[PDB]
Amino acid sequence: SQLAHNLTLSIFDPVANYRAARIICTIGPSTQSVEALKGLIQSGMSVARMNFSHGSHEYHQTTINNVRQAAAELGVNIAIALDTKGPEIRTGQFVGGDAVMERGATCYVTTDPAFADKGTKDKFYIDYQNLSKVVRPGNYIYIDDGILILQVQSHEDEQTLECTVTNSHTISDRRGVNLPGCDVDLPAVSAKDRVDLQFGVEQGVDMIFASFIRSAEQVGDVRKALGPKGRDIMIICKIENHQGVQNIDSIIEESDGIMVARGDLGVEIPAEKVVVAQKILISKCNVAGKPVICATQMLESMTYNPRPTRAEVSDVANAVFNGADCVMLSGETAKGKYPNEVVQYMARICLEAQSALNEYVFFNSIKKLQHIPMSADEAVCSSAVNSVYETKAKAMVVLSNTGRSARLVAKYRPNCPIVCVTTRLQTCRQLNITQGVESVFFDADKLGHDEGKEHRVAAGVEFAKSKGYVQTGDYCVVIHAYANQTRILLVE
Amino acid sequence: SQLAHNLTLSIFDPVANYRAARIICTIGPSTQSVEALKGLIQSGMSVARMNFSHGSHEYHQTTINNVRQAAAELGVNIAIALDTKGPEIRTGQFVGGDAVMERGATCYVTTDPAFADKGTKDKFYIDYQNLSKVVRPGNYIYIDDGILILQVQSHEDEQTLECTVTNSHTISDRRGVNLPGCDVDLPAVSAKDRVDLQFGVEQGVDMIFASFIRSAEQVGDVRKALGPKGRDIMIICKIENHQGVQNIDSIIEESDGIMVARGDLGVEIPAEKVVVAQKILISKCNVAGKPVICATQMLESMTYNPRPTRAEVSDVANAVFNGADCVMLSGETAKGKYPNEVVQYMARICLEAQSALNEYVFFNSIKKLQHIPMSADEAVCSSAVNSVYETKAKAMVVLSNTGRSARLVAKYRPNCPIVCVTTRLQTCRQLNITQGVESVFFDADKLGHDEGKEHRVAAGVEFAKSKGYVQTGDYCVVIHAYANQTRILLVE
Amino acid sequence: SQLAHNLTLSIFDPVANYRAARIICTIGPSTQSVEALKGLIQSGMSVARMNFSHGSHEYHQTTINNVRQAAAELGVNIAIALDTKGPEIRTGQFVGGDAVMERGATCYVTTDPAFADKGTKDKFYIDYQNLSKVVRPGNYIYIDDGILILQVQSHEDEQTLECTVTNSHTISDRRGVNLPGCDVDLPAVSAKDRVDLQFGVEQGVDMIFASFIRSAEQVGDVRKALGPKGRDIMIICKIENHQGVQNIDSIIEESDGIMVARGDLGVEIPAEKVVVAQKILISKCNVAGKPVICATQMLESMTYNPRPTRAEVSDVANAVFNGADCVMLSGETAKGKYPNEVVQYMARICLEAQSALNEYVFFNSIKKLQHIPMSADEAVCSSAVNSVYETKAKAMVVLSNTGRSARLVAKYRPNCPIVCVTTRLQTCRQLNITQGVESVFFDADKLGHDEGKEHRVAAGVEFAKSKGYVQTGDYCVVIHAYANQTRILLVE
Amino acid sequence: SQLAHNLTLSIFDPVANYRAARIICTIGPSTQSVEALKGLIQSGMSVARMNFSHGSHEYHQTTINNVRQAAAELGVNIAIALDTKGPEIRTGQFVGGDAVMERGATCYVTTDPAFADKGTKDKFYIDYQNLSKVVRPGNYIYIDDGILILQVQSHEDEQTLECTVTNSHTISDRRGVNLPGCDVDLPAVSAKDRVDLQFGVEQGVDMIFASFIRSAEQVGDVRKALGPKGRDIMIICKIENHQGVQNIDSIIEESDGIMVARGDLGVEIPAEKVVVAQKILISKCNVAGKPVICATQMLESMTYNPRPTRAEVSDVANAVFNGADCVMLSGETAKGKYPNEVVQYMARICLEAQSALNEYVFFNSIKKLQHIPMSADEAVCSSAVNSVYETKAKAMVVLSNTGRSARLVAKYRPNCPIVCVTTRLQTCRQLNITQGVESVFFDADKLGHDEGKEHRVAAGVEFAKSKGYVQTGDYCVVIHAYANQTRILLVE
Ligand SMILES: O=S(=O)(O)c1cc(S(=O)(=O)O)c2ccc3c(S(=O)(=O)O)cc(S(=O)(=O)O)c4ccc1c2c43
Ligand SMILES: O=S(=O)(O)c1cc(S(=O)(=O)O)c2ccc3c(S(=O)(=O)O)cc(S(=O)(=O)O)c4ccc1c2c43
């Protein structure tokens, strides 16, 4: 009924008084300082992503410290995400630093280490040791962000494949390689990830964006890598090839959330198919009640120009229409010229798309898929959201300690803000990747367990009033405990 | 969707574990004694009806006292209803008390008082002074359960009517005269009624069944006759002629419920139209959320025979399928030979019908008629009944002091028992006219104010446990303060 | 949504311009003559039932001849039904013609033939030879329309059961017996049925009401009994005990329709359960698209009184509310005092109930149960009926040779008349047991095959105009071929 | 329910066997020759667009002739569209042709004609005489794709405006000046347009893409300029500014379809609001049952690069998800380097998106918006599409001379191909702007009038067979005469 809803809109009408979608910003040279982080917060950042593909621990420690200091000064809670380098397949080095590959030529790719330092156009190293048992004649090998394509012809021997060069491209040392038709069986985490995951645990990071996740079992290996002290850290799986797409259900089941990495998927999969995989993965997460992030190539052209292209604008709005909880900036904020303006524009686009989006369609499609009998939690949250639509309540207040009930309510897509009142700061930070929720910390050790829930409910209603969401005479729907209890409150 | 539900039924499956419909019994000489009342209660009586058309205040006082004593000895709460004589048009006296009226033969009816004694087969008497100025040229005067018809030709004078006798009836003193195309404008209540109603209030009756209600304003007259001390007594309007049916919407709005008096309706409305009027009135009260009683000609042949006719049984079951809260016995218990057996048989027909009735169709049809936005009470009660269906809960517990919210929940027809926990014994008795509710009295003088609700909630739950409605690991939906809080509780 | 529909009705509104339900009348002494059949036709009979439990072939031949002659004179098509005697279990004879059975007494029921002529209260014959292998100790034996109840105690020997008499009742010779807890395994048809079925085939009867149908296999035995020349005769199965109820699905599947024989069911099954089995069997037939007849004890009291009881009126309306195609009169027309008036009253009751009945509920419940993909026939008829609701068309015209497409359209319950145009008179007669259809004979041998369907469609539209169903500017929905073709016609 | 459909998809399943969306290509010097046009057709072009902003009548005549010749050699019918230059506000001439405008610096714009030649950086010229009396104190004058902004301060005189230059732009001769808060009241069509439109009619173009439509009355002006001989030519209104968007309902009602000109909208509406305007306009046309085209900035970067950006691909796919009938290429085919490849890639994105799009949501959303009662045509076409879903039919055949009913069927979005069988070659070409229809020309001069429809029906069915849409035992839904007859045919 989005179609029926479009009929009634006018683009000269006011936008909503709140933005539900959440903006993740990658921190780098343009943005690491406390003042630049403050600008990013004020522009609309909810999450600071650290790309551990680059920078040492010391560099990321400065990110960590500066985010906390910026957030403390503005009086907000900002989530910190550790995005891992992950396992990789790269070529070796070449004699003269470079290899000119020509359409029609035959070359040999080998996994023998002796060729690591001495590659040429005719024969060169690929560091993936299982390369030969996982490829068949006919498969393609992509190298250099998929620009050079080789076709496998035969096994020259146990370690060496004879390949045709399908297209001309010059490659330099240590380029990335992809196998679009094969199951890559590299481990879940690299040796470097293990070191980086431990550091992320020691430094209190909120979530991991775990690279190259291919199967459900690898999620548990990331979890083991985080150790017992890391058990509350969220694992968001980055879906980057066909195996991740194919195994999405069981991956979603084990993960705490999903990243749709469109540019990585796009190396292996036609761009038109990635548009469609983005729709599927996002709807499956919406149905699982798990946050989903739309990432890479979002307003890329605004890295160096003051304005993005019109197609990039439609990409960002369409991620919100698809159902994304979050939209993500990489080089635009890490190294770009206009970090503040890009985040501000991203927020505006999201806000505009949300004003057009019919939330009732998400609520109703999601509710119709529940199997009866529902459990108590599910019944209470979907009813509570139903009660919002039925009374036209203007806010929800959900008391949640771990954040579970807040995410379960957000899953059902009310058409008003959700204020989560929690007794854990780390819940305030982790809910920054859930659309449509804002969190209020209630310090139980300072103020009391509030067993009767009245102080926490008042803290929620007060926050909603300070934002203009509710006034005297409006309804607010309250949920508390996971969450088996609801009230419809008349606001004073 | 009753249709789809019918497909799945087997008459060899066991019946539901609770009976939702309520049985009202008229007390008379067969049934007035404490032992006979106890037999009525154990057989299924929830309400004792006093018919104030017969007997003295002292006689009704004894019914009151004995009902209270029988209920006390059984530990139950039984409602007491006062059914008013109401206004009437009595013919006067005749020659020796008789005449024979025949077809063709000319008759003259009088509004003049001197002819109160001296009547004939020619010219006689009627005490309704508005007779001539209401009855038009050609209308019908029924006199005696509608069995004698007379046709008003012309006004012989101001206080006389010139009449065809249109059939052969042999009548006798002081008759039920019936003016069917005629809007009878006798007042709401007679002098007897005003005196009887005051007695009712003095004696603490739970409800009035107010005879012959024709318009909404007449409901006000009953309420004023009940006065300041009668403000908590329910008024159930007895719909007995075409005007009450025409005016049904405004009558329901002013009243606390309706009795459909099929026999009386039938004096001037063809029987097949009364069957439909019954459907309309029941559905309008189901939507109003007010109790509705199906009365007269229920299991009549069981007054003197040990079993009813097959068409009588279907009448009672269809009353339940139509949506009645209550079915009522008149002579069958007041002066019949099988009072226990007729009540037990009524209870068994009700329970059989209920096991075939799809409550969900009721819930859904009613919910769909709700105006959006809903008020908080409406939204909370529909949602709680919705949650019963979604979680297949096995009981509801409703905290309700006045009974209002118990009735609001019952309106939506959950497919499990409702347990009202109440602090007023009069709410326990008054809810006896609401299908699908059992009330648990919580003695606040003797047990405290239970500000936390927890003692009342547990009393509710324990009652449900003692009846076998719920056991360990079942769900129960709990509602309370109007009613703006809901919980879905796992039974311990 | 019957409940929502009740809210909008008024009993002073005009009834529909057509009666959809069909009245079956049993012919006897009060009604066998041509003038009395003419009166019955004019009063509303569509079907003349012959009860072959009584009368010889010669008697029924007069019924057959007189129905045809009455129908020819009035210019209508009347269906003729042969209702079989069927297999029976009876007691033998008693010494002195009579046996006084007393609560508490022991008696012996035996299947040894030697006792056929010499029964007494202590020991007597029951002609069902498998009696002893089919009963267990604890079972009941009903005798004399279920008035006398025996309980089986033990097997006295291979042929004799020792029984307690549970209640006092005097029985006379050759009384009927029932076994409520046992599977009766008598053959489908008696020796007498076979002779009567052959006669019915020779005389061109339209349908058989086949007595005591217990399982699906017995329907095929009735069919074999009718022989190759009887293959177009409809078999309507009379459902009279628990086995028929239990096996209803597979019976419906093989039968051409169902009779719900409430009084026979009521011998074995509590009357409250029979109310419910009537609902189930009728809805299952509505879903199967097969006619269903509500029979026995319909307005029984109007056999000797000029008016029926109010409960009997509600029984007839409630059969139409349940979904019956037909309602049936037995002694009321066969031997009663008021045959014309009873049929007229039955028609009026049906008409009144139909005016209140929400046909859209039947259409929508039935449509939602179809499995997708539907076959072409089903899709065309349900769409055609949907198109009636959508355009508010005022009639349907369905060209059907065998009557199959007309019954498939009637199954979907349009809210307008259906005019079936058929090239077989016997289809005109057989459709008399399908609600909501009237048939027009088109003699193809006289007028042409009408391959372009225009003359048959005009014959339908003309009939609809002559009845007042449609006028200039109204829509009429036309279906033709079973039936894979639809048009929405503007009436000229 | 798009949401539920997303859950079931796999990007590794095969694509649909037909592409429903239609591809429009702008002809220019890369593409004008018969061979290049043939390459366009085989690559997926259904419509040749002539941009009458450039080139002479002789030049467009050659496009016309070559399109017809290329289509004839391939045996297909291709639509020809004339896109009008439309009215404009050109700045005049300058000093040497240039100036540099900077921030702060004062500028004076003139409506006086003597300054047509002699302009400066100070004071220059604009040919829109209503300039001063439309533009208010403080409004914006954009001049050059919106890149130069100027702010109107006050009226320096009657025919002059006193202006802040609010940025640094260095402009040049005869510019696209843009008055964004301004309701531009230039007439509907210029003199060039009236001359070009008459040429269009003489040359038998199928449709007009009418530039810069702002109001409904303006549609009349186009139609009058087309005159009596142009009455069958479709008018597609190009929506290019805020007024066309404000007035969208009445414009659609008067027009035969809409083009959403994103680039032009974007001059005065922020890009994120144009994304939403696109959603609104497409849905309003889907409900109107009129073709809607998504145009400008489609795969722009593919004008000179061998591949588009990833955000461009998503733009095209989302155009299809929004519901567009047609996507349009401008410079990409008019002067680009890869005209064949851009069309083939467009076709592949369209087909990918379609395989993910749930047509049923469209069908259902549209059906629900229909007013009851429906007219016969509406009811027949929705029902026929409903029958496709119910029987999982694999094709529709629609007989439609003018194309009206083909478009009415397409509106309801069956999930199978529609084959229109038509007697007019111009209906074959005009339906090229309606998604999901292929047209089969039935030559009535050469083949007869087919009064029985049977030859046209079989031509439809055979075409569907030759494309592999249906084989033996599939269903096909056939609709014909407006369209008031339907058949569900089993394929032989
Ligand atoms: O390969 S090493 O760099 O020596 C290395 C060091 C450590 S460490 O001592 O804990 O730091 C590892 C800890 C845990 C590992 C697990 S597990 O999740 O703990 O079960 C699985 C695999 S596997 O390679 O996928 O089979 C591991 C491979 C290599 C590991 C470790 C693995
Ligand atoms: O028992 S008799 O009276 O001698 C007698 C006479 C004839 S008749 O020659 O055709 O008239 C029978 C014809 C067909 C019969 C069939 S069947 O449907 O044809 O298969 C079944 C049974 S059964 O008893 O259920 O096994 C029959 C029982 C007794 C029959 C006939 C039966």
Q: Tell me the nearest-neighbour CA distance from B176 into chain C, angstroms.
A: 20
Q: Scan for tokens 């979005």, then name that residue.
A: D413
Q: Please enumerate in sequence order all residues whose Cβ is within 8 A of that of C92, keeping only pairs 6 or more positions apart, or say none.
A: C115, C116, C117, C119, C124, C125, C126, C127, C173, C174
What is the residue type of D475? Y
Rounded Cα distance between D29 and C2, Å, is: 69
CB C363 within 8 A of CB C390: no
Cis peptide before B291 (omega within 30 of 0): no
Active site annotation includes C404: no
Nearest CA to ligand 2 atom 4: C191
Rounded Cα distance between A210 and A231, Å, is: 15
Cβ-contact C189, C198 below 8 angstroms = no
Indicate the SS3 state at residue C411. Answer: helix
CATH of the domain at C246: 3.20.20.60
Angle of CA points B445, B446, B452, to nearest 5°:
75
- The C-alpha angle with vertex C320 and arms to C319 and C326, in degrees rounded to 5, equals 85
Contact assignment for B489 to A487 by CB distance below 8 Å: no
Is B359 in contact with B389 (CB distance < 8 Å)? Answer: no
* CATH code of residue C175: 2.40.33.10
Residues D272, D208 within the same domain: yes
D-facing residues of A in 263-282 (CB < 8 A) are: 263, 266, 269-277, 279-280, 282
What 3-state DSSP class applies to C185?
Answer: coil
Phi and psi torsions of B78, nearest 5°? -125, 135
Determine the angle formed by the axes of helices D191-203 and D216-226, rounding to 10 degrees.
50
Question: How far is Cα A435 from Cα A428, in angstroms, rounded to an integer?
Answer: 13
Distance CA A154, CA C349 (A): 88
- Binding site annotation covers D52? yes
Residue C191 Cβ inside 6 Å of ligand 2? The answer reads yes
Does C65 lie in the same domain as C167? Answer: no
CA distance D245 to D251: 9
Host H or E run for residue A142: strand A140-143
Domain of D63 in residue numbering reads as 19-86+188-353
Which chains does chain C touch, 3 or more C-beta pairs < 8 A?
B, D
Among residues B37, B30, B40, the alpha carbon closest in space to that of B70 is found at B37
Q: Which of C375, C339, C356, C342 is nearest to C415 (CA)?
A: C356
Cβ–Cβ contact B484 with A under 8 A: yes
In angstroms, the first-to-last Cα distance of chain A is 35
Q: Is the dihedral of CA C375, C380, C381, C387 positive or negative?
A: positive
Task: Please list the residues that pair with B485 across neighbouring strands.
Answer: A487, B480
CA pair distance B440, A228, nearest whole angstrom:
50
Is D203 found in the same domain as D287? Answer: yes
Bridge-partner residues for A237, per DSSP?
A210, A258
> How far is Cα A94 from Cα A124, in angstroms, rounded to an integer?
7
CA dist D58 and D32 (Å) reads 13
**Are the CB atoms for A294 and D370 separated by under 8 Å?**
no
Tell me how many helices (H) and strands (E) chain D has.
19, 19
Q: How far is the C-alpha of D469 from the C-alpha of D359, rounded, in Å?
A: 17
What 3-state DSSP class applies to C312? helix
Q: How far apart are CA C103 and CA D177, in angstroms?
A: 111
- CA of B488: which chain A residue's CA is closest? A484
Domain end point (choices C353, C371, C405)? C353
Of B376, B390, B489, Cβ closest to residue A391 = B376
> Is the domain of A341 the same as that of A197?
yes
**Close Cβ partners of B295 (under 8 Å, ≥ 6 residues apart):** B24, B238, B259, B260, B261, B262, B327, B328, B330
- Closest CA in chain A for residue B377: A488
Q: Which DSSP category does A49 fall into? A: E
End-to-end CA distance of chain B: 35
Element (H, E) at D38: helix D34-43
Asked if C21 and C350 touch (Cβ cutoff 8 Å), the reply is: yes
CB atoms within 10 A of CB A90: 15
**How is residue A484 annotated by DSSP?**
-
* Cα pseudo-dihedral C422, C426, C428, C434, rounded to 10: -110
Q: Of B150, B171, B187, which residue constitutes the final position of a domain? A: B187
Name the residue type at position D228.
P
Is C296 known to be catalytic?
yes
Edge-to-edge strand ranges of the sheet holding A485-490: A437-441, A418-422, A395-399, A475-480, A485-490, B485-490, B475-480, B395-399, B418-422, B437-441
Say whether A406 sits in a helix, a strand or coil: helix
- For B465, the enclosing helix (H) or strand (E) is helix B454-466
Q: Are residues C285 and C154 in the same domain?
A: no
Neighbours of B58 (CB within 10 A): 7
Alpha helices in B164-261 (DSSP H): 191-203, 216-226, 242-246, 248-254
Yes or no, beta carbons of D310 and A11 under 8 Å apart: no
A240 is in an annotated binding site: yes
Instruction: Report which DSSP code applies to A350.
Output: H
For C77, counting Cβ atoms within 10 Å of its Cβ (0-12 exposed, 13-18 middle, 19+ buried), the class is: buried
Residues B370, B439: one domain?
yes
Helix (H, G, I), strand (E, B) or coil at C288: helix
**Catalytic pick from C31, C63, C296, C423?**
C296
> Residue B163 carries which DSSP code?
E
D90, D192, D224, D307: the active-site residue: D90
d(CA A461, CA A419): 8
Q: Residue B374 — φ and ψ, nearest 5°?
A: -90, 155
Question: Measured between CB atoms, does D318 come within 8 Å of chain C?
Answer: no
Distance (Å, whole) CA D357 – CA B152:
74
Nearest to A162 by CA among A105, A90, A112: A105
Residue C405 near residue C376, CB atoms below 8 Å: no
B248 in the same domain as B347? yes
Cα dist from C15 to A81, C317, C354, D87, D121, whole Å: 73, 14, 8, 65, 85
CB contact, 8 Å: C311 with chain B?
yes
Statement to judge: residues B219 and B365 lie in one domain: no
**B167, B147 in Cβ contact below 8 A?**
no
- β-strand partners of D123: D108
Q: Which single residue is written with the structure tokens 């040049």?
A: D172
Nearest to A263 by CA among A90, A89, A88, A146: A146
* d(C-alpha B271, C-alpha B54), whole Å: 27
Whether the Cβ atoms of residue D331 and residue D297 lie closer than 8 Å to each other: no
Handedness of CA B10, B13, B14, B18 (dihedral sign): negative
**Dist CA B49 CA A451 (whole Å):** 48
The domain boundary residue, chosen from D135, D152, D187:
D187
Task: Tell how far CA A189 is from the center of its chain.
Answer: 18
Flag whether D51 is marked binding.
yes
Q: Which residues pair with D490 in a beta bridge?
A: D475
Give kind and range of the element (H or E) at residue D140: strand D140-143
- Amino acid (one-letter) located at A421: V
Tokens read off for D238: 């190009």
CA of C196 from ligand 2 middle (Å) equals 14
CB within 8 Å of A133: residues ≥ 6 apart: none
Strand, coil or helix: what is D47? strand
Spatial separation of the C-alpha atoms in residues C438 and C445, rounded to whole Å: 22
| Number of compact structural domains in chain C | 3
Q: Is C404 in the pocket of ligand 2 (CB under 6 A)?
A: no
* Amino acid (one-letter) located at A306: P
- For β-strands C106-110 and C160-165, DSSP reports them as antiparallel
In sequence order, which residues have a C-beta less than 8 Å from that of residue C85 and are 6 or more positions away? C52, C53, C190, C192, C193, C196, C211
C-alpha to C-alpha distance for A43 and A29, rounded to whole angstroms: 18
Nearest residue on chain B to C285, judged by CA atoms?
A: B7
Discontinuities after residues in chain A (C–N over 2.5 A): 481
Token pair, residue B262, equals 């099929």
The Cα–Cα gap between D38 and D72 comes to 10
CA B31/CA A57 separation, integer angstroms: 92
CB contact burial D272-293 (16+ within 10 A = b; e otherwise): bbbbbbbbbbbbbbbbbbbbbb
Pick the closest to residue B391 from A336, C352, C76, A484 (CA basis).
Answer: A484
Q: Does D453 touch chain C (CB under 8 A)?
A: no
Question: Which 460-479 residues of chain B touch chain A by CB within 8 A?
Answer: 475
Say what the resolution is, in angstroms.
Answer: 2.1
Are the CB atoms for A332 and A263 separated by under 8 Å? no
- Please tell me whether residues B228 and B309 are part of one structural domain: yes
> Which CATH number do you get for residue D469?
3.40.1380.20
Looking at the fold, whether D358 and D463 belong to one and the same domain comes out as yes
A187 lines ligand 1 (CB under 6 A): yes
Residue with tokens 């404490």: B34
Question: Is residue A333 annotated as part of the catalytic site, yes or no?
Answer: no
Same domain, A319 and A367: no
Q: How many helices (H) and strands (E) does chain C have?
A: 19, 21
Which of B120, D73, D170, D384 lies closest to C379 in space, CA to CA?
Answer: D384
Size of chain A in residues: 492
Question: Which of D310, D332, D346 is best to mutate for the A interface (most A CBs within 10 A)?
Answer: D310
Which atom in ligand 1 lies closest to the alpha carbon of residue A189?
25
D262/D391 same-domain check: no
Please give the Cα distance from A157 to A110 (Å, whole number). 9
CB C412 within 8 A of CB C379: no
Nearest in space to A405 (alpha carbons), one of A234, A289, A270 = A289
Is the CB of C221 inside a 6 Å radius of any atom of ligand 2?
yes
- B354 burial level (CB within 10 Å; 0-12, 13-18, 19+): buried
Report residue A253 as tokens: 């089941």
CA B187/CA A415 separation, integer angstroms: 54
Look at the alpha carbons of D67, D70, D73, D75 in this order and tell me if their dihedral is positive or negative: negative
Instruction: Concatenate the DSSP letters of all residues of B311-333 into one string.
Output: HHHHHHHHHHHHT-SEEEESHHH
Ligand 1: does its nearest atom lie under 6 Å from the Cβ of A224?
yes
Closest listed residue to residue A205, CA positions, set A237, A224, A189, A229: A229
Q: Which of A194, A199, A223 to mutate to test the pocket of ligand 1 (most atoms within 8 A of CB)?
A: A194
A170: which strand partners? Answer: A100
Catalytic residue status for A166: no
